[PDB]
Amino acid sequence: SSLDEPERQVVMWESVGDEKDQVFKQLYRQVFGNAYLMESDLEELLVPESQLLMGSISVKDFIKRVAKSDAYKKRFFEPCGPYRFVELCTKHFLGRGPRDQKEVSEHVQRLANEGYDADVDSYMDSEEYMSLFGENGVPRFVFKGTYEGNDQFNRLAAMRQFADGSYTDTRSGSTAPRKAQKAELTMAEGDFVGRAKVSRGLPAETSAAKTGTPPVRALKGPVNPRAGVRVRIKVVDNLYQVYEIPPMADPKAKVNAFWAKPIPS
Amino acid sequence: MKTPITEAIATADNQGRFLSNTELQAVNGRYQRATASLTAAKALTGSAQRLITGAAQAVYNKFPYTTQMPGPAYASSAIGKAKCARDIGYYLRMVTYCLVVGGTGPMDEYLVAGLEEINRSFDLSPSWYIEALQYIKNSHGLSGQVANEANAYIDYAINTLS
Amino acid sequence: MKSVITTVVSAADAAGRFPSNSDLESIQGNIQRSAARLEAAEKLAGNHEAVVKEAGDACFAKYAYLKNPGEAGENQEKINKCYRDVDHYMRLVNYCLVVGGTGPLDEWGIAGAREVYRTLNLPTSAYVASIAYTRDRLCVPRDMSAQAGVEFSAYLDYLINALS
Amino acid sequence: MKSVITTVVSAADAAGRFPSNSDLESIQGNIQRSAARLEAAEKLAGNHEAVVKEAGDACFAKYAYLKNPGEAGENQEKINKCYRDVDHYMRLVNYCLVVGGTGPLDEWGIAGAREVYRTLNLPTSAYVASIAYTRDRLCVPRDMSAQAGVEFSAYLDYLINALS
Amino acid sequence: MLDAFSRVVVNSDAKAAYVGGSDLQALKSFIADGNKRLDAVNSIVSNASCMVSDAVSGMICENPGLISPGGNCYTNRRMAACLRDGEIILRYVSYALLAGDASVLEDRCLNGLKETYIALGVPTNSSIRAVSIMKAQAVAFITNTATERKMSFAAGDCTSLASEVASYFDRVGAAIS
Amino acid sequence: ALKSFIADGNKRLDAVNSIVSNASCMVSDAVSGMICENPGLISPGGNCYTNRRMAACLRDGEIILRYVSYALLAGDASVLEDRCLNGLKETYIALGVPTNSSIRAVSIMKAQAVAFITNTATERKMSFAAGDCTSLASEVASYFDRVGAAIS
Amino acid sequence: MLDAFSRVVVNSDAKAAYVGGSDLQALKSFIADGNKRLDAVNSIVSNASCMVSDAVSGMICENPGLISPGGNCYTNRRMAACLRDGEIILRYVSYALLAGDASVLEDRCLNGLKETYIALGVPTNSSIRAVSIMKAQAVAFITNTATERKMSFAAGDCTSLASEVASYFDRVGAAIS
Ligand SMILES: C=CC1=C(C)[C@@H](Cc2[nH]c(/C=C3N=C(/C=C4\NC(=O)[C@H](C)[C@H]4CC)C(C)=C\3CCC(=O)O)c(CCC(=O)O)c2C)NC1=O
Ligand SMILES: C=CC1=C(C)[C@@H](Cc2[nH]c(/C=C3N=C(/C=C4\NC(=O)[C@H](C)[C@H]4CC)C(C)=C\3CCC(=O)O)c(CCC(=O)O)c2C)NC1=O
Ligand SMILES: C=CC1=C(C)[C@@H](Cc2[nH]c(/C=C3N=C(/C=C4\NC(=O)[C@H](C)[C@H]4CC)C(C)=C\3CCC(=O)O)c(CCC(=O)O)c2C)NC1=O
Ligand SMILES: C=CC1=C(C)[C@@H](Cc2[nH]c(/C=C3N=C(/C=C4\NC(=O)[C@H](C)[C@H]4CC)C(C)=C\3CCC(=O)O)c(CCC(=O)O)c2C)NC1=O
Ligand SMILES: C=CC1=C(C)[C@@H](Cc2[nH]c(/C=C3N=C(/C=C4\NC(=O)[C@H](C)[C@H]4CC)C(C)=C\3CCC(=O)O)c(CCC(=O)O)c2C)NC1=O
Ligand SMILES: C=CC1=C(C)[C@@H](Cc2[nH]c(/C=C3N=C(/C=C4\NC(=O)[C@H](C)[C@H]4CC)C(C)=C\3CCC(=O)O)c(CCC(=O)O)c2C)NC1=O
Ligand SMILES: C=CC1=C(C)[C@@H](Cc2[nH]c(/C=C3N=C(/C=C4\NC(=O)[C@H](C)[C@H]4CC)C(C)=C\3CCC(=O)O)c(CCC(=O)O)c2C)NC1=O
Ligand SMILES: C=CC1=C(C)[C@@H](Cc2[nH]c(/C=C3N=C(/C=C4\NC(=O)[C@H](C)[C@H]4CC)C(C)=C\3CCC(=O)O)c(CCC(=O)O)c2C)NC1=O
Numbered sequence A: 001s002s003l004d005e006p007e008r009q010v011v012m013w014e015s016v017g018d019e020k021d022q023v024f025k026q027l028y029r030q031v032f033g034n035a036y037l038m039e040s041d042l043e044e045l046l047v048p049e050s051q052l053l054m055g056s057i058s059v060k061d062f063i064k065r066v067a068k069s070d071a072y073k074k075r076f077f078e079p080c081g082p083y084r085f086v087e088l089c090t091k092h093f094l095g096r097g098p099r100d101q102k103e104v105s106e107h108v109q110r111l112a113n114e115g116y117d118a119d120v121d122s123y124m125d126s127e128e129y130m131s132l133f134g135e136n137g138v139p140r141f142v143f144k145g146t147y148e149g150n151d152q153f154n155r156l157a158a159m160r161q162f163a164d165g166s167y168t169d170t171r172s173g174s175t176a177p178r179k180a181q182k183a184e185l186t187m188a189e190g191d192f193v194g195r196a197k198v199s200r201g202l203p204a205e206t207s208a209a210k211t212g213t214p215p216v217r218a219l220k221g222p223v224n225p226r227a228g229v230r231v232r233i234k235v236v237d238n239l240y241q242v243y244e245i246p247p248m249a250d251p252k253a254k255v256n257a258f259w260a261k262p263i264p265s
Numbered sequence B: 001m002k003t004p005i006t007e008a009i010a011t012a013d014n015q016g017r018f019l020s021n022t023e024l025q026a027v028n029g030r031y032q033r034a035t036a037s038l039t040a041a042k043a044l045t046g047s048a049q050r051l052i053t054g055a056a057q058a059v060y061n062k063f064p065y066t067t068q069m070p071g072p073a074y075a076s077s078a079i080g081k082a083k084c085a086r087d088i089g090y091y092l093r094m095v096t097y098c099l100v101v102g103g104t105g106p107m108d109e110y111l112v113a114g115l116e117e118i119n120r121s122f123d124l125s126p127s128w129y130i131e132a133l134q135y136i137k138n139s140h141g142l143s144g145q146v147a148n149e150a151n152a153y154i155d156y157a158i159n160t161l162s
Numbered sequence C, D: 001m002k003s004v005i006t007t008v009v010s011a012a013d014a015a016g017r018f019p020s021n022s023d024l025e026s027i028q029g030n031i032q033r034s035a036a037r038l039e040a041a042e043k044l045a046g047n048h049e050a051v052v053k054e055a056g057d058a059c060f061a062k063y064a065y066l067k068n069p070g071e072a073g074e075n076q077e078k079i080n081k082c083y084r085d086v087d088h089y090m091r092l093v094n095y096c097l098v099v100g101g102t103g104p105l106d107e108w109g110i111a112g113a114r115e116v117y118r119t120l121n122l123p124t125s126a127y128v129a130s131i132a133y134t135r136d137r138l139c140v141p142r143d144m145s146a147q148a149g150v151e152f153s154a155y156l157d158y159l160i161n162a163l164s
Numbered sequence E, G: 001m002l003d004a005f006s007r008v009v010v011n012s013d014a015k016a017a018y019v020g021g022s023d024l025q026a027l028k029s030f031i032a033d034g035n036k037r038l039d040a041v042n043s044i045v046s047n048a049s050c051m052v053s054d055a056v057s058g059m060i061c062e063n064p065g066l067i068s069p070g071g072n073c074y075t076n077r078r079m080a081a082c083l084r085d086g087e088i089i090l091r092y093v094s095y096a097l098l099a100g101d102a103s104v105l106e107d108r109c110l111n112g113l114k115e116t117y118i119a120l121g122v123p124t125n126s127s128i129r130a131v132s133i134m135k136a137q138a139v140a141f142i143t144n145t146a147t148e149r150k151m152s153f154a155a156g157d158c159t160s161l162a163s164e165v166a167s168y169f170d171r172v173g174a175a176i177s
Numbered sequence F: 001a002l003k004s005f006i007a008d009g010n011k012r013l014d015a016v017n018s019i020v021s022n023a024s025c026m027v028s029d030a031v032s033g034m035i036c037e038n039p040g041l042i043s044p045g046g047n048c049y050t051n052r053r054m055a056a057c058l059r060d061g062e063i064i065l066r067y068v069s070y071a072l073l074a075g076d077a078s079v080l081e082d083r084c085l086n087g088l089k090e091t092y093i094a095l096g097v098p099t100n101s102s103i104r105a106v107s108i109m110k111a112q113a114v115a116f117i118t119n120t121a122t123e124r125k126m127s128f129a130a131g132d133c134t135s136l137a138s139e140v141a142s143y144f145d146r147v148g149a150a151i152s
């Protein structure tokens, strides 16, 4: 429980009409995978989004009902395999990846008889989310200092590719004829996670050195900047060129005018 | 090409003759007309950003079906619009080459040779290019013999399109 | 990173909106306080090698037990390293006098501070004895101006407010 | 184009003889390998977009100085010429898996490599930093069969010894 | 998440160098244009909703292939997404302009954007076309050469910030293609 | 190599055409208008003697005007530095070049160049268009003091 | 095979003549400017390695079809042969500049190059862009006009050698076209 990662966690305290959407878009980025929404996805989850305004329904029960709506079910439940769905609930609610495969084989078993609601409520009712913050904490990709597995370093961080950016959990911003996802963290029993999602899945902290600008123009003083480009349409044509510097001339006293050479002596 | 300098050499070369006084006066008529030619070439070059995109819109206002009708020959797409503006830039650049050289030499070998087969094959009409060329002749904004020399090569391109 | 800029546009980023006149009014204080801040920066940067010379032994004067065997700085290969660690802190406060915040302080110095000062038996009270000796050596007519002194001094006891 | 067939019809035309059972027994092993060697080239062809992208992003991430100005990885078009330079090498190893031998590699990519990277200042140490990722980044129970990954990993090591 | 006050800090930290008086002379210019910096962005965000609507409509008036079915702006689900993609590009070039740094523009909203778009199937060339209209609009406002709608301003010029906005818009197009 | 200029053309390329068309005319004024206030240079012991130090000053005004007109053509002062300003002070004090003459002769070029693009030259008048090159006139005034602050 | 001195002695061999006044004056001028002739040759061979890389890459960036599959410079063996086909060209031109006579690249390089390239399949309309680029590099080195490298020289003029080396580089494009 030490060293670098994010500290700011939005908490939704005593919420008035402008600290609603300060945390609401952070909810809609997190549990909906920064997808696009906002007509009858936001006519859709109105009967829970009005409920958490007096504290009558907590933030724990809000995401519990939002995952039961078919904004989530029409985005992360149909165009997904059985491995993709257990992948996304760890991302959206728990902020991690699956720690092992028997946790996966638990959760797809829990899909197979108790249903979809009883599975997604079990994603809440562990002591993971309550140890994260509790009910009022917004779900966020938190970093532990001491991790119990270097697979689970980047079982966690091959989920979060670019939280500072654009990560597109569907195939567009909730596209229309939704193609299936591929469940790209398959990882059966005794293996690690690949390197290709580690260096892109780490936040802006270990970026130690940067690049340097070169000098821009020619350093030979007798210049020749063509620089010529100036594209009009395809008819690319040359600008005010500044030729060269020339050498000057030769003073050559052919006259000389010194004491007469032919002194006849 | 067909410079008056190379059409005076090739005249004297087809006769096996040294350059007589018939050919040196043809060269000196190029040199007299040159300073009204090299200023029209200089004026159309800098004013090309306005004269191309001004003339492209003059076609779409007279022939608005070239922006709405589907197909590859029309400019109803961004590929077809960018290739339509490319075509007007060919006609303007060939005029500035004919002004620099003097005479309709560069646009004969580069542009008008074999052009009727290209328009007939790719279904694109020559009346679109005439409305673009009449725009540049109406809006190049020169006068004197600087305009009378520049309009003499716009009118050559129109007479090959009809 | 904590500057004036880095907080308000991240709050606007959490708001997801354009920078309004709340965002613009905070930047107006920078040109009021650049005439306050960075005059003490080159006053430090022309004097920091002498500042570490007089503050590095002030903790030695308060704590002579460090030179006893079995303590933190007890041989001369650590006594120059004793002066090296406090020389980072004067270089760090030189950075946040430029940025107008505690950006470089609680990202490089205080971020990850108290774990290594505990597990390497380092006296945290002997850290701030060099810092408090730098806090009371100010001369608001002589060294910098009056408002440049309290821009400088409030960062220094913030280190004591971070180390304790 | 060194393959198993082109080895023996050029050994026999050297002597000037007919194909005997020292030439017919060789092509029997071409049957005993193509059931698994062609399995890897079937997988590599339909997956190469996910492999050439992961190969270059394990090169620039380690060789981060190549994006500095003055280097060989300047602009976006040079990096777009860097995935073009690698997706040839994942295509040439696809062409070697179907001729049986190392035919296309040692006369299309390898032959003349020492003068086209020394002249254009291309570092030959970065190429081996990406191909060895793909070799190390292999996993025979899931991604392949156990006999494709024996020979698919054997042609990347033909590149690595010929690039080093 | 850095800025121009910290841009001279982070390189001097890399050599453990104390910042001197001559190093902050660039920041002496950066406090010299302290009203001029805000003098640019309040023209931008005042005309921002007109800017993003003018940019994407001129992007698609030249390119009717997107309004062809199977394009990328054919459906209103795509179309409302499309200029909502464009305003974040407008939001972060302003965010880079407030910092005086190309920092906020690429640590957020730009790393992971090229491989997103090729997973959307977005034609990237029309996105180059949209940002080039977005580049040309912003330099008309902050030099008060917006010939449709001028605004009242102070006396002087912003030629350096006109180069600064164009050196923010280019790395948008340089990263998505 | 395109010079990367995105908007407001046909004045910046027109500004450099009013400078490099008389760049040898401007240097021949600043190598000769220096002497009427500092006549110790052709004095023996000055830095313009034995007909090669006068000739090396003709190369010096040429390479300081081409490397500021390339800075005008790019529109940014980056190749004013990346081939010219990297250590140009350390060659002048090691030679014994007097900094009083070089700080005054650059302001001869500053007064010459802002009369060219505003068409207020008292000798020759260009046949230029109608408009204003006065946003450019602030740009070249902010380009001749960057070498006025480098050579100090 | 023949220099400037031996060119004169085969012209006075046809006349059964000696060497006298009018035929030794143009030959002593070769000796007079002979220090500038060495001083120009060294300026080329000092940095000829970057002159053959920039010239080959200048032809490719103008003609993108030369690195297409089925382009002439597609594989590495064909590309590396291109990178030395142009260095053999540069080696023999610097021999004719040194000896002051074009009778060495005429014999051992130019004679039969046109019939050789059409046999192998080398495009000769694109081989002449690689030489014309190298012509512009070589005249921007014996006059200090190179944009990214300045070389110290004695004061004077060398435009006569700039027209001598441009006559060699043009006849390479006249022997293969
Ligand atoms: C439970 C499993 C577990 C491990 C196996 C280790 C390994 C480990 N190290 C780091 C992360 C790190 N580990 C190191 C350590 C070192 N760098 C060096 O050059 C030295 C060899 C070594 C010191 C002795 C450093 C410097 C970081 C970077 C911290 C950061 O980037 O924020 C991380 C990601 C978490 C983080 O950023 O803090 C992990 C899992 N730590 C763990 O929690
Ligand atoms: C924080 C960073 C951030 C961004 C940079 C943008 C980037 C972005 N755009 C889209 C998503 C999209 N972006 C576009 C935009 C375009 N496509 C085109 O062909 C046009 C050229 C261009 C309009 C100008 C379209 C049309 C979609 C939806 C595609 C679809 O139907 O799935 C998505 C996926 C979520 C969604 O589909 O809504 C993301 C992350 N959004 C962000 O959140
Ligand atoms: C044709 C060539 C070819 C290869 C060489 C591999 C290379 C490869 N591996 C992975 C992907 C992976 N590679 C591994 C690695 C392993 N898996 C295990 O269970 C083992 C313990 C270990 C064998 C070394 C893992 C764990 C993943 C999934 C992690 C992720 O989500 O990226 C991916 C990303 C796509 C995916 O999800 O599969 C790719 C391209 N794939 C190919 O198509
Ligand atoms: C690459 C070479 C190249 C150039 C040298 C310029 C030259 C140039 N400028 C303009 C056109 C113009 N040139 C000016 C410039 C000026 N008017 C003034 O009042 C100032 C004195 C002066 C600037 C210093 C103006 C104001 C216009 C018209 C506006 C415009 O076309 O942008 C035109 C078109 C009009 C014409 O001449 O027919 C040309 C060719 N453009 C180029 O492409
Ligand atoms: C960069 C920040 C910076 C500082 C904090 C001061 C600290 C400081 N003061 C002095 C040196 C001095 N500093 C003071 C100033 C004072 N003495 C007092 O009793 C008053 C409280 C105060 C204002 C009158 C005086 C009078 C001296 C000379 C004698 C002395 O040390 O007291 C010296 C030189 C060496 C030394 O004596 O330590 C230094 C580094 N100077 C600085 O440049
Ligand atoms: C290295 C030495 C070497 C050889 C000499 C050949 C010898 C050989 N020939 C055949 C096997 C065969 N050969 C023939 C060919 C023919 N049958 C006819 O009736 C036609 C007249 C004639 C056509 C040319 C057929 C039809 C088979 C059976 C295999 C099949 O039908 O696919 C088989 C396979 C036998 C089996 O698996 O049962 C072998 C090993 N192979 C070798 O490895
Ligand atoms: C069919 C066989 C075949 C190959 C094996 C490659 C080999 C190859 N690569 C390049 C050319 C190149 N190759 C690279 C790639 C890289 N440069 C680096 O510094 C990195 C180490 C690496 C990134 C992965 C780059 C950046 C260029 C262009 C360099 C330049 O000319 O600017 C060229 C020169 C022609 C060109 O510019 O495209 C050739 C022949 N190309 C082929 O056609
Ligand atoms: C086919 C359809 C079609 C369009 C929709 C427009 C779109 C459009 N607008 C502008 C160009 C511009 N657009 C604006 C934007 C605005 N002007 C204002 O004053 C308002 C506040 C704001 C919304 C209207 C500005 C300021 C310019 C610069 C020129 C100008 O001042 O009008 C440009 C030129 C940009 C460039 O060249 O890169 C284009 C293509 N043009 C078209 O051809």
Ligand SMILES: C=CC1=C(C)[C@@H](Cc2[nH]c(/C=C3N=C(/C=C4\NC(=O)[C@H](C)[C@H]4CC)C(C)=C\3CCC(=O)O)c(CCC(=O)O)c2C)NC1=O
Pocket (backbone or CB within 6 Å): C021, C024, C025, C028, E032, E033, E034, E035, E036, E038, E039, E040, E042, E141, E142, E143, E144, E153, E154, E155, E156, E157, E158, E161
């Ligand atoms: C948060 C709100 C806020 C602003 C919007 C700005 C508005 C602004 N800019 C300037 C002031 C200035 N503005 C410019 C710049 C410009 N003038 C123009 O005509 C160009 C359009 C533009 C280029 C960007 C210059 C050169 C100065 C004078 C220098 C200065 O005072 O900063 C001034 C002082 C002069 C005056 O009173 O008008 C103000 C108030 N400042 C603020 O505090």
Ligand SMILES: C=CC1=C(C)[C@@H](Cc2[nH]c(/C=C3N=C(/C=C4\NC(=O)[C@H](C)[C@H]4CC)C(C)=C\3CCC(=O)O)c(CCC(=O)O)c2C)NC1=O
Pocket (backbone or CB within 6 Å): F090, F091, F092, F094, F095
């Ligand atoms: C045998 C080969 C050999 C070399 C290539 C140089 C290399 C060299 N240069 C310098 C040192 C230097 N070199 C210069 C450069 C110059 N000095 C001037 O008066 C001019 C303006 C400019 C030449 C254009 C300067 C100013 C220094 C002093 C320290 C420095 O600025 O680097 C030093 C440090 C000690 C010294 O001066 O010798 C060395 C080893 N010395 C050698 O012994």
Ligand SMILES: C=CC1=C(C)[C@@H](Cc2[nH]c(/C=C3N=C(/C=C4\NC(=O)[C@H](C)[C@H]4CC)C(C)=C\3CCC(=O)O)c(CCC(=O)O)c2C)NC1=O
Pocket (backbone or CB within 6 Å): F022, F025, F026, F028, F029, F032, F033, F034, F035, F036, F108, F111, F112, F115, F120, F121, F122, F123, F124
């Ligand atoms: C020995 C005494 C001597 C001088 C004091 C200077 C005279 C001189 N003239 C100008 C001023 C100028 N100098 C030039 C330069 C020239 N005019 C041209 O047409 C040519 C290109 C070039 C030299 C022939 C120009 C164009 C102006 C502006 C004049 C004007 O306002 O029209 C300036 C700068 C402004 C000033 O401070 O007055 C000076 C110092 N030249 C001398 O010889």
Ligand SMILES: C=CC1=C(C)[C@@H](Cc2[nH]c(/C=C3N=C(/C=C4\NC(=O)[C@H](C)[C@H]4CC)C(C)=C\3CCC(=O)O)c(CCC(=O)O)c2C)NC1=O
Pocket (backbone or CB within 6 Å): A224, F001, G047, G050, G051, G054, G055, G057, G058, G060, G061, G062, G132, G133, G136, G137, G140, G141, G145, G146, G147, G148, G149
């Ligand atoms: C698309 C790719 C592309 C390129 C690579 C460049 C290639 C290039 N360089 C030059 C032109 C030149 N190239 C050089 C070469 C060099 N200068 C040095 O100091 C070094 C020794 C060496 C490169 C390392 C020189 C000296 C010139 C002439 C002057 C100059 O441009 O600097 C020319 C001449 C124009 C012509 O006449 O056709 C071209 C095409 N341009 C392009 O469009």
Ligand SMILES: C=CC1=C(C)[C@@H](Cc2[nH]c(/C=C3N=C(/C=C4\NC(=O)[C@H](C)[C@H]4CC)C(C)=C\3CCC(=O)O)c(CCC(=O)O)c2C)NC1=O
Pocket (backbone or CB within 6 Å): G032, G033, G035, G036, G038, G039, G040, G042, G141, G142, G143, G144, G153, G154, G155, G156, G157, G158, G161
């Ligand atoms: C063994 C190797 C060897 C060399 C490399 C040259 C080196 C060299 N060059 C010149 C001398 C010279 N070199 C040049 C040539 C030039 N000046 C320029 O400004 C142009 C860039 C370039 C034109 C090609 C000139 C003009 C002289 C002056 C002397 C003369 O003209 O004879 C001199 C005699 C005077 C001197 O500089 O001390 C020498 C020794 N000579 C050699 O013996």
Ligand SMILES: CCC1=C(C)/C(=C/C2=NC(=C\c3[nH]c(/C=C4\NC(=O)[C@H](C)[C@H]4CC)c(C)c3CCC(=O)O)/C(CCC(=O)O)=C2C)NC1=O
Pocket (backbone or CB within 6 Å): B056, B059, B066, B072, B073, B074, B075, B076, B079, B080, B081, B083, B084, B085, B087, B088, B090, B110, B111, B118, B122, B124, B128, B132
């Ligand atoms: C240098 C001499 C030269 C000329 C004259 C020339 C004309 C030319 N115009 C063409 C196409 C075209 N030209 C247009 C232009 C137009 N259609 C419209 O609707 C507009 C009204 C008009 C523009 C003003 C269009 C849309 C095409 C694409 C047709 C196709 O590819 O099928 C093509 C077919 C190849 C191509 O460019 O894509 C040629 C060869 N090419 C030359 O090399």
